[PDB]
């Protein structure tokens, strides 16, 4: 009741701050000609991410540029408005920080601190797999991040190595929040990425924050094995495996790791760790985490097992054709994005 009461008090203040920012979001805190473009870091079906330099300060940022017309075409208005509203309201060491946002006739812009270490995904595929201490270090950060997000009644719903950055201290930054939803009870949308979907998302019953603990199990498995627990040529075949209740482990997994994963990759949501009476403490007190100093992880005082090569450098991102950023003379989709 010292450590536990400190966390309760911390989370109560955190919720008060979150709700104030959620109710009165920041808007229009920069403009495009404050920035020079350097390089395209990523492309998607309705936007791009660009490395940019702030002209006055010289600071580097990742600028997410979303084409309003394409957002409307692909039915992503609510997700995009939600992502920005969440990002400007949350505050936690392992969440990316929104520095500026604004819009113009054509685009929405979210400007975030640049993290040159890139995605966990690339590092994992390059090295093959992480040792269990390395995986555990990242897993502990996700456990704490979900403890925070769930205390705000947010379900995260898109955990995967693609959405985790590794910063220059070797710690994680969670990137994407469009799918994050306020859920005190249950929700029903089929959304996420096939390999990481909990059975109850596939099966069309309502679901709750316990899906994030299932996804943690998938992430830990993929980090430690180099491949996810459920894979196949086509998503429908992946879904059949997920709901089956059967999983196999590499022979190099420790006994403690297998026991944790059997309890996270638990199809019966009423038996799944994270979702029992003692909540996240069943995970934090599990034998696999016995060596984890949870407070030291939160304070970023643990020496990271891996620090990306320090080189403005973009070597941890792929190369893309550089295309114009065109801003129309006509305002597009103004009413739809009024709150951005």
């Amino acid at each position: 009741g010292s450590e536990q009461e400190s966390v309760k008090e911390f989370l109560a203040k955190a919720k008060e701050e979150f709700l104030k920012k959620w109710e009165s979001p920041s808007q229009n805190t920069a403009q495009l000609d404050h920035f020079d473009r350097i390089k395209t870091l990523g492309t998607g079906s309705f936007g791009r991410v660009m490395l940019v330099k702030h002209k006055e300060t010289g600071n580097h940022y990742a600028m997410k540029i979303l084409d309003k017309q394409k957002v409307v075409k692909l039915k992503q208005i609510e997700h995009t408005l939600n992502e920005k509203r969440i990002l400007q309201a949350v505050n936690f060491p392992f969440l990316v920080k929104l520095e500026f946002s604004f819009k113009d006739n054509s685009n929405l812009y979210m400007v975030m601190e640049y993290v040159p270490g890139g995605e966990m995904f690339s590092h994992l595929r390059r090295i093959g797999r992480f040792s269990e201490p390395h995986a555990r270090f990242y897993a502990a950060q996700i456990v704490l991040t979900f403890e925070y997000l769930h205390s705000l009644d947010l379900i995260y719903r898109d955990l995967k190595p693609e959405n985790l950055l590794i910063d220059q201290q070797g710690y994680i930054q969670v990137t994407d929040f469009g799918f994050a939803k306020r859920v005190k009870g249950r929700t029903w949308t089929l959304c996420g990425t096939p390999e990481y979907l909990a059975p109850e998302i596939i099966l069309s019953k309502g679901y709750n924050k316990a899906v994030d603990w299932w996804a943690l199990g998938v992430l830990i498995y993929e980090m430690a094995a180099g491949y996810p627990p459920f894979f196949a040529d086509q998503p429908i075949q992946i879904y059949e495996k997920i709901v089956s209740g059967k999983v196999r482990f590499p022979s190099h997994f420790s006994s403690d790791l297998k026991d944790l994963l059997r309890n996270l990759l638990q199809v019966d949501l009423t038996k799944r760790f994270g979702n029992l009476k003692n909540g996240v403490n069943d995970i934090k007190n599990h034998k696999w985490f016995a060596t984890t100093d949870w407070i030291a992880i939160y304070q970023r005082k643990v020496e990271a097992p891996f620090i990306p090569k320090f080189k403005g450098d973009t070597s941890n991102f792929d190369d893309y054709e550089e295309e114009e950023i065109r801003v129309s003379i006509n305002e597009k989709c103004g009413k739809e994005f009024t709150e951005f």
Partner: peptide
């Protein structure tokens, strides 16, 4: 091996949301 089956699945690159 299971790894070989993972490679054969074709889903070794970045994965999109559904």
């Amino acid at each position: 091996t299971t790894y070989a089956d993972f490679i054969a699945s074709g889903r070794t690159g970045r994965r999109s949301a559904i």
